[PDB]
Design a protein. Structure first.
Ligand SMILES: [Mg+2]
Ligand SMILES: [Zn+2]
Lengths: 103, 37, 262, 46, 158
RNA sequence: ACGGAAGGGCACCACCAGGAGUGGAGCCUGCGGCUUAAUUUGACGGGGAAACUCACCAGGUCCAGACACAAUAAGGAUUGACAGAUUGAGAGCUCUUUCUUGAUUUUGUGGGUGGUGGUGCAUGGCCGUUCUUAGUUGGUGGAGUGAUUUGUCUGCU
C-alpha cells in the first residue's frame, strides 16, 4: 500500500496533457483513488535583449519568452503499478516525478 | 571565457552556462530559448 | 577503504593543489611516490582539479620517482586524461603550456610514455588535434633508438589514419639505427597498401593516401635503403608502381633502386 | 633487445593485466615506508 | 548532483544540444539522423538514431566504446554511468539471418521451444521491427511431424 | 545621375499646446585633456568595480636548439632524493655533504625543426551588415538600323 504524489513539468502543453490524461484514465480504469490533475500557473520566463548588436543607432529593447507549465496528480497503489506506469509513461519534452512520502 | 569561441568577452555567466551573447543567441534554439514576443 | 586521516589530510592537500602556482609542493604530496599504494592516495588529492602547474610538477616528481610500470600507470590515468580534457574542453581547443611541458616530462621515460600515453591515445579516438599536439610533443623530444624502434613498430601495425601516419613519419624522420625486424615491420606496413590481383585485398589497397604517407615512405626509402633485402625492395618498388605519388613516387623508387641489400 | 620489448608495446594491455594480476597489493600502512606516518604527522602539524 | 529546477531543465537542454552538435559533426559519413538521451536510475542511455550503424558499430564494437569514453571524458561521467546504443542499420534484430542462427543456437544449446521463439520474437520486436514471424517445423522430440508459428506485430505477404 | 523647379504625404529621434526638464549648483560617472614609471585600450564595449579580471609599469626569476655535425666521455659527460650554506623585496641560483649518478651528454657549427611562428594566396563554408530588397523582373508580342521604347498610361483612385 503506497500513497504517491506525481508532478509533471513541460513547455509543450499537448504532450503534457497527453501524459496527464493518459495517467488519469489509466489510473481510474483499473480502480484507484486519486486527486485529479491539478494545474499550477504557467510561469512565463522572459529575457530582455537589446536591439543594438553593433554600436550603430540609438538603444531600443526587446524580449524573449518561455512558457513553463506544471501539473500534479495524487494516487494510492502498490509497488508494481507505480513501477510499470512510470516506465510506460516516459515521454520527451515532458518531465515526470514520482514522490512516495506524504510529509 | 565563452566555452564556444575562445572569447573573454560577451560572457553570459548567468545560470552557469557561460556562453558569450553572440554564440548564446545562436545556440538559444538548441538550449530551449525560442522567439515568442 | 582508507583511514579518515588519509581522507582529510589529502582532501586538505587536494584543496591546496587546486591553486598552487610556485614555491614548494606540499610535504604530503612528495611522499606519495614512495608509497606502495600511491594510487589510492593520489585520488584523494583529486587529480582532475589540480592547476596546470601541479600537473607539470607532479609529472616531474612521479615520472622521476616511480618505476616504468608506475610511470606508465601515472601518465595513463592522470596525464593522458588531463591532456585530452584540456584539449577537448578548451575553446580554441588548445593545450596549456604546463600540461605540455608535462608531456615533454613524460617522454623522458619513453616506455612509460608510449605504452601509457601514445598507445591508449591512438586507440581511443585520437583525432587530428590531439595528434597535431602529441605529434609536436614526440617531434620535439629525443627518444632512445630501441624504444623509438619499438614504438614505430607498434604504430606500423595500427589501422591507417592520417595522425598515425604523422607519428610514423615523425619516428622515421628520427633516422636512428633500427633493428632489421623494425625495418621489416616498415616494409610490411608499406607493402599492405598495394593491390593484390590474385584475390586478396583490404581497404588499404584502394584508399586515398595523403602527403604524409608518401613523405614517410620517402624518408624510409631515404634512410633504410641499404637495410632491406632484394625481395622486400621489389615489393616496395611494386607499391611505388601501383600506389605512387606524382612528385614523390619517382624519388621513392629512385631511393629504393640506389640501395644495397643485406 | 627487440623481441622482448615489442611483445610489451603491442600487448601492453595484456602485460598490464598480468603485471596488475601478479603485483597488486591493497593499502597497507606498515608495508609503506615506516617513517611515513612520521611525515603525515610532520605535515599535519604545520 | 542537485541543480535548481529551471536551471536543471535548461542545462539538460544544453546537454542534448551539445551532444546533438558533436554527433552531427562526428558521424557525418554514417548517415546520422538524430539522438535521444534517456535518464535511468543506474546509467544514462544515449541512443544514436544513425542510418548507418555498421560503421558506428565498427570492429569489436570499438567505435562505440571510443565514442562513449569521449562523451564520458569531456562530460565527466563515472566509468560505466554512460552507455551508447545505436538504432538503424546494424541492429541485429532486423536481420532474419542472425535470428535464424539465434534460433538454431537457442535450440542446439538446449533451451525450450516456446522460450527460444518468444525470446527471439520479443528481441526482434524490441529492436524496432514493424513485425516478426518465426516458424518451427519438425519432430520436436516426438514421432509425428509438427509445425508452429510465432507471429507478432505487422507483416505483409503479397 | 542632379536640382536649392514645383506637388503631395506624415512623422513628438519634426513643429504646435503644454508637461517634466537639462544646460546654472554640489556630488557621481563616462569621454577628452594634462600628469604619470604606468595612469592598458577600443569607438557602450556586459567596460562595474583593492588580488583575480589586466591586457599597462619598476624590478626578480625560469625554459629555450627539433636536429644535424665535430671534440669530450665510462678510469666520467652530466640528469634525479635531500640537509645546511642560502637570500635579495619574495622565489629560484650556485657548491660542500649524505646520496641517485651513468650519456638525458657538456661545448661549438649549419640548412630549419618549433611552427603550444605568426602574416598572405587559393578553395569550401559559418556569424555581422545592404538595394537594410517593399516595385521590380524577365517572358513572349508591337515600334526603332540603333542606344532605347511600349508594357510601366490621359483619367480617377
Ligand atoms: Mg521584344
Ligand atoms: Zn562565443
Amino acid at each position: 500500500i503506497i500513497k504517491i504524489r506525481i508532478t509533471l513539468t513541460s513547455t509543450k502543453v499537448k504532450q503534457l496533457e497527453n501524459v496527464s490524461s493518459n495517467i488519469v484514465k489509466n489510473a481510474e480504469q483499473h480502480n484507484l483513488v486519486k486527486k485529479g490533475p491539478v494545474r499550477l500557473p504557467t510561469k512565463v520566463l522572459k529575457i530582455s535583449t537589446r536591439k543594438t548588436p553593433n554600436g550603430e543607432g540609438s538603444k531600443t529593447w526587446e524580449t524573449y519568452e518561455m512558457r513553463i507549465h506544471k501539473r500534479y496528480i495524487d494516487l494510492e497503489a502498490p509497488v508494481q503499478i507505480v513501477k510499470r506506469i512510470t516506465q510506460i509513461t516516459i515521454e520527451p519534452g515532458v518531465d515526470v516525478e514520482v514522490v512516495v512520502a506524504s510529509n | 571565457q565563452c566555452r564556444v569561441c575562445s572569447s573573454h568577452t560577451g560572457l553570459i555567466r548567468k545560470y552557469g552556462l557561460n556562453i558569450c551573447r553572440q554564440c548564446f543567441r545562436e545556440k538559444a534554439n538548441d538550449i530551449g530559448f525560442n522567439k515568442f514576443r | 577503504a582508507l583511514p579518515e586521516k588519509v581522507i582529510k589530510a589529502y582532501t586538505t592537500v587536494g584543496s591546496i593543489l587546486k591553486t598552487w602556482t610556485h614555491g614548494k609542493l606540499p610535504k604530503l604530496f612528495k611522499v606519495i611516490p614512495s608509497l606502495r599504494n600511491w594510487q589510492d592516495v593520489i585520488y584523494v588529492t583529486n587529480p582532475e582539479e589540480w592547476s596546470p602547474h601541479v600537473v607539470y610538477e607532479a609529472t616531474k616528481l612521479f615520472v622521476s620517482n616511480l618505476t616504468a610500470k608506475e610511470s606508465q600507470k601515472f601518465i595513463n590515468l592522470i596525464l593522458l586524461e588531463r591532456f585530452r580534457d584540456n584539449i577537448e574542453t578548451s575553446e580554441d581547443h588548445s593545450l596549456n603550456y604546463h600540461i605540455y611541458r608535462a608531456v615533454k616530462k613524460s617522454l623522458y621515460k619513453p616506455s612509460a610514455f608510449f605504452k601509457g600515453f601514445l598507445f591508449p591515445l591512438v586507440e581511443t579516438g585520437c583525432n587530428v588535434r590531439e595528434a597535431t599536439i602529441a605529434g609536436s610533443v614526440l617531434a620535439k623530444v629525443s627518444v632512445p633508438a630501441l624504444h623509438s624502434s619499438a614504438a614505430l613498430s607498434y604504430l606500423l601495425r595500427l589501422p591507417f589514419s592520417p595522425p598515425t601516419t604523422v607519428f610514423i613519419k615523425i619516428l622515421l624522420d628520427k633516422k636512428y639505427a633500427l633493428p632489421y625486424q623494425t625495418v621489416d615491420d616498415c616494409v610490411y606496413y608499406f607493402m599492405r597498401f598495394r593491390i593484390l590481383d590474385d584475390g586478396s585485398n583490404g581497404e588499404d589497397a584502394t584508399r586515398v593516401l595523403p602527403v604524409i604517407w608518401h613523405k614517410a615512405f620517402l624518408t624510409f626509402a631515404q634512410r633504410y635503403k641499404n637495410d632491406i633485402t632484394q625481395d622486400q625492395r621489389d615489393f616496395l618498388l611494386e607499391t611505388v608502381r601501383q600506389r605512387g605519388h606524382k612528385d614523390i613516387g619517382p624519388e621513392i623508387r629512385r631511393e629504393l633502386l640506389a640501395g644495397a641489400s643485406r | 633487445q627487440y623481441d622482448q620489448i615489442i611483445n610489451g608495446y603491442e600487448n601492453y594491455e595484456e602485460e598490464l593485466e598480468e603485471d596488475e594480476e601478479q603485483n597488486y597489493q591493497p593499502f597497507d600502512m606498515s608495508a609503506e615506508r615506516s617513517d611515513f606516518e612520521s611525515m603525515l604527522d610532520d605535515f599535519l602539524d604545520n | 548532483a542537485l541543480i535548481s529546477k529551471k536551471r536543471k531543465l535548461v542545462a539538460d537542454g544544453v546537454f542534448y544540444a551539445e551532444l546533438n552538435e558533436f554527433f552531427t559533426r562526428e558521424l557525418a559519413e554514417e548517415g546520422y539522423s538524430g539522438v535521444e538521451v534517456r535518464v535511468t536510475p543506474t546509467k544514462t542511455e544515449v541512443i544514436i538514431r544513425a542510418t548507418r550503424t555498421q560503421d558506428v558499430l565498427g570492429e569489436n564494437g570499438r567505435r562505440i566504446n571510443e565514442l562513449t569514453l569521449l562523451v564520458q571524458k569531456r562530460f565527466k561521467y563515472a566509468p560505466g554511468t554512460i552507455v551508447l546504443y545505436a538504432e538503424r542499420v546494424q541492429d541485429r534484430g532486423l536481420s532474419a539471418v542472425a535470428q535464424a542462427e539465434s534460433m538454431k543456437f537457442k535450440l542446439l544449446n538446449g533451451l525450450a521451444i516456446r522460450r527460444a521463439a518468444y525470446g527471439v520474437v520479443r528481441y526482434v520486436m524490441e529492436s524496432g521491427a514493424k513485425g516478426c514471424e518465426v516458424v518451427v517445423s519438425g519432430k520436436l522430440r516426438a514421432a509425428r511431424a509438427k509445425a508452429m508459428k510465432f507471429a507478432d506485430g505487422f507483416l505483409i505477404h503479397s
